[PDB]
Amino acid sequence: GSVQIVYKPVDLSKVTSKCGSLGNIHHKPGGGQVEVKSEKLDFKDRVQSKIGSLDNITHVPGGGNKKIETHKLTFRE
Amino acid sequence: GSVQIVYKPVDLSKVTSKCGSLGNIHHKPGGGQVEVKSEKLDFKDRVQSKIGSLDNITHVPGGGNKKIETHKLTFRE
Amino acid sequence: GSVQIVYKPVDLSKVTSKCGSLGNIHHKPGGGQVEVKSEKLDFKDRVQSKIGSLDNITHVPGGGNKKIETHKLTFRE
Amino acid sequence: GSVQIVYKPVDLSKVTSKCGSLGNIHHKPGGGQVEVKSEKLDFKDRVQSKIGSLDNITHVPGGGNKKIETHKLTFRE
Amino acid sequence: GSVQIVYKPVDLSKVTSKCGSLGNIHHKPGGGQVEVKSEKLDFKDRVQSKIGSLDNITHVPGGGNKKIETHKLTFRE
Amino acid sequence: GSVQIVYKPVDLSKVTSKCGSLGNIHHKPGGGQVEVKSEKLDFKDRVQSKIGSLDNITHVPGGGNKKIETHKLTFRE
């Protein structure tokens, strides 16, 4: 018997952006209040967690564009 | 018997951005209040965690563009 | 029997940015208040953790562009 | 002619209070936001004024009792 | 002619208070935000004023009792 | 003609307080933010004023009791 495999995807695409001025942006939060209460935690495996935050962000990229791409190949008898 | 594999993906893409001035950006939080209470923690394996934060960010990149790409190949009898 | 493998991905892509002035950026937080309370911690394996923060950031790169890329190959009888 | 006046009010009253413990009192405001806008002010005579406040109070007297009392007398030809 | 005046008010009153423990009192404001805008001010006579405050108080007297009392007398031909 | 005046008010009153322990009192403000803007001020006569405050107080007297009392007398032809 015989087996042959060719895996040759060709990627030629683009992700692009154009802009003038981003200009006046304001973020003026009047601070709230947070309370959290707990007895025991057991984050045993691959947990991602966040507790009692009160958290502010101003993410303002000039681009902010993104590409994600994944390839796989598997073989058995 | 025989086996042959060729793994030759060709990547030619782009991620790009263009901008004028990013200019006036403001972030003026009036500070809140956070309280968190707990008895025991047991973060046994690969945990990522954050507790009682009260946290402010102004992330302003001129680009901020991103690409992610992953390849794999596996073999058995 | 025989086995042959060729692993030759060709990467030719780009991640790029262009900008004028980034200019006026302000971050003027009115400081909040944080309290956190706990009895025991047991961060046994590969934990990443942060408690009672009250933390401010102004990350302003001229670029900020990123690429991530990973390759693998595996073999057995 | 003749005139005679006697002004002799007799005040014997009381204002009084009795209490146990005043105990658990909480005041935990999540801070709001106030904006006020104006062009000209002309507070010419005996004005009492307050603008753009955002103001918190916890007045907790053990007594807090009050008395007010006023007397007058007037004469003419 | 003749005129006679007697002004002899007799004040014998009391203002009083009694208390146990005043105990647990909390005041934990999550700080708000205030903005005020104006062009001209002209507080010409006996003005009392307050602008753009953001102000916190915990007045906790053991007494806090008050008395106010005023007397007057006037005469003419 | 003749005029006679007697002004003899007799004041015998009291203002009083009694207390146990004043005990646990807390004041933990999460700091707000204040902005005030103006062009001209003209506080010409007997003005009392306060601008752009952001101000915290914990007034805790053991007494705090008060008395105010005023007397007057006037005469003419």
UniProtKB/Swiss-Prot annotation, chains A, B, C, D, E, F:
It is found in: Cytoplasm, Cytosol; Cell membrane; Cytoplasm, Cytoskeleton; Cell projection, Axon. Expressed in neurons. Isoform PNS-tau is expressed in the peripheral nervous system while the others are expressed in the central nervous system. The record marks K8, K14, K18, K28, K37, K40, K67, K72 as: Not glycated. There is a cross-link at K8, K14, K18, K28, K40, K44, K50, K66, K72 (Glycyl lysine isopeptide (Lys-Gly) (interchain with G-Cter in ubiquitin)). The modification N6-acetyllysine is found at K8, K14, K18, K28, K40, K44, K66. The modification N6,N6-dimethyllysine is found at K8. Phosphorylation at serine and threonine residues in S-P or T-P motifs by proline-directed protein kinases (PDPK1, CDK1, CDK5, GSK3, MAPK) (only 2-3 sites per protein in interphase, seven-fold increase in mitosis, and in the form associated with paired helical filaments (PHF-tau)), and at serine residues in K-X-G-S motifs by MAP/microtubule affinity-regulating kinase (MARK1, MARK2, MARK3 or MARK4), causing detachment from microtubules, and their disassembly. Phosphorylation decreases with age. Polyubiquitinated. Requires functional TRAF6 and may provoke SQSTM1-dependent degradation by the proteasome. PHF-tau can be modified by three different forms of polyubiquitination. 'Lys-48'-linked polyubiquitination is the major form, 'Lys-6'-linked and 'Lys-11'-linked polyubiquitination also occur. The modification Phosphoserine is found at S2, S21, S49, S53. The modification Omega-N-methylarginine is found at R46. Tau/MAP repeats lie at residues 3-33, 34-65. It is linked to In Alzheimer disease, the neuronal cytoskeleton in the brain is progressively disrupted and replaced by tangles of paired helical filaments (PHF) and straight filaments, mainly composed of hyperphosphorylated forms of TAU (PHF-TAU or AD P-TAU). O-GlcNAcylation is greatly reduced in Alzheimer disease brain cerebral cortex leading to an increase in TAU/MAPT phosphorylations. Promotes microtubule assembly and stability, and might be involved in the establishment and maintenance of neuronal polarity. The C-terminus binds axonal microtubules while the N-terminus binds neural plasma membrane components, suggesting that tau functions as a linker protein between both. Axonal polarity is predetermined by TAU/MAPT localization (in the neuronal cell) in the domain of the cell body defined by the centrosome. The short isoforms allow plasticity of the cytoskeleton whereas the longer isoforms may preferentially play a role in its stabilization. The tau/MAP repeat binds to tubulin. Type I isoforms contain 3 repeats while type II isoforms contain 4 repeats. Interacts with MARK1, MARK2, MARK3 and MARK4. Interacts with PSMC2 through SQSTM1. Interacts with SQSTM1 when polyubiquitinated. Interacts with FKBP4. Binds to CSNK1D. Interacts with SGK1. Interacts with PIN1. Interacts with LRRK2. Interacts with LRP1, leading to endocytosis; this interaction is reduced in the presence of LRPAP1/RAP. This is Microtubule-associated protein tau. The chain holds residues 621 to 697 of 758 of the full protein.
